[PDB]
Design a protein around this ligand. Structure first.
Ligand SMILES: N=C(N)Nc1cc(C2CCNCC2)cc(C(F)(F)F)c1
Length: 291
């Protein structure tokens, strides 16, 4: 009955309701704990054989939206597998994002094969610097590296207060591509409203960069550690910004349900759920300040 709940659950919020809702743990908790996680039944996968590709045995990609790696390799039976899902965006548009776990030593090459296959123009990495080499490895070179005949070069490193932006070139055969890599370093320990502005600013900077891709922007890869918590927060904020700007309302509950349908467990905790409301409440204030 979880599928039907996720299809119909909705809580349209107007501006005044949104500011109050963000500061209402009583209403937020009751709403959040009613949402099914939609975790994949482990029977869908050969759990013992995938231990080197999955960070957590209970966090699996929902088969229907799973990102399949089509590049051939007959020697490796796991070359087609990656713990990643296609995520619908604003107005249910298909493949707007890819939510995936932070690459591990054994999945760095798989991650770059996904980047190439999908023609990904933007990668959003959500961490803290103290979590490095643990919650996420440094899968990019200092200057240049070759993965699966794909030359990966870091052309520029742009340091900002809350993120490091890398301009990356990708080359294989006669093809040459560009990539924007946003390494967000200000994910907070405590999801208080004063910590929401860097997340909203990153969301809006990424949106402006996606606009520059023109129509038919290829999937934006978003990753944290398990690829559901912080990833869910970023993506829900990204979708709800477009909804607030175009419809003058936000439906965080419906957005969270659409995310859960695509990948089980998107937005893991009620603190993360409230954080999205804090970010949306702040965006409404920013919009009112130019109105
Ligand atoms: N719709 C897609 N395939 N990509 C995609 C396009 C957009 C643009 C933003 C400007 N309005 C038109 C849509 C924004 C984003 C995102 F916010 F995530 F960054 C992703």
């Amino acid at each position: 009955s979880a599928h039907e709940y996720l299809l119909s659950a909705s809580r349209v919020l107007r501006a005044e309701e949104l500011h109050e809702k963000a500061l209402d743990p009583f209403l937020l908790q009751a709403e959040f704990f009613e949402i099914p996680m939609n975790f994949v039944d482990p029977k869908e996968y050969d759990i013992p054989g995938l231990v080197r590709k999955n960070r957590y045995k209970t966090i699996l990609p929902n088969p229907h939206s799973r990102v399949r790696l089509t590049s051939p390799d007959p020697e490796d039976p796991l070359s087609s597998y990656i713990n990643a899902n296609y995520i619908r965006g604003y107005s249910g548009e298909e493949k707007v994002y890819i939510a995936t776990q932070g690459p591990i030593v054994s999945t760095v090459a798989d991650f770059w094969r996904m980047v190439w296959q999908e023609r990904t123009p933007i990668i959003v990495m959500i961490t803290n610097i103290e979590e490095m080499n643990e919650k996420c490895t440094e899968y990019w070179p200092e200057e240049q590296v070759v993965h699966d005949g794909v030359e990966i070069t870091v052309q520029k490193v742009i340091h900002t207060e809350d993120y490091r932006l890398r301009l990356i070139s990708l080359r294989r055969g006669t093809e040459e591509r560009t990539l924007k890599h946003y390494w967000f370093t200000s994910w907070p320990d405590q999801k208080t409203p004063d910590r929401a502005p860097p997340l909203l600013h990153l969301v809006r900077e990424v949106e402006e960069a996606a606009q520059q891709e023109g129509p038919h922007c290829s999937p934006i890869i978003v990753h944290c550690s398990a690829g559901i918590g912080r990833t869910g927060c970023f993506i829900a904020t990204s979708i709800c910004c477009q909804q607030l700007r175009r419809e003058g309302v936000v439906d965080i509950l419906k957005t969270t349900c659409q995310l859960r349908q695509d990948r089980g467990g998107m937005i893991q905790t009620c603190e993360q759920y409230q954080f999205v409301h804090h970010a949306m409440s702040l965006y409404e204030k920013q919009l009112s300040h130019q109105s």
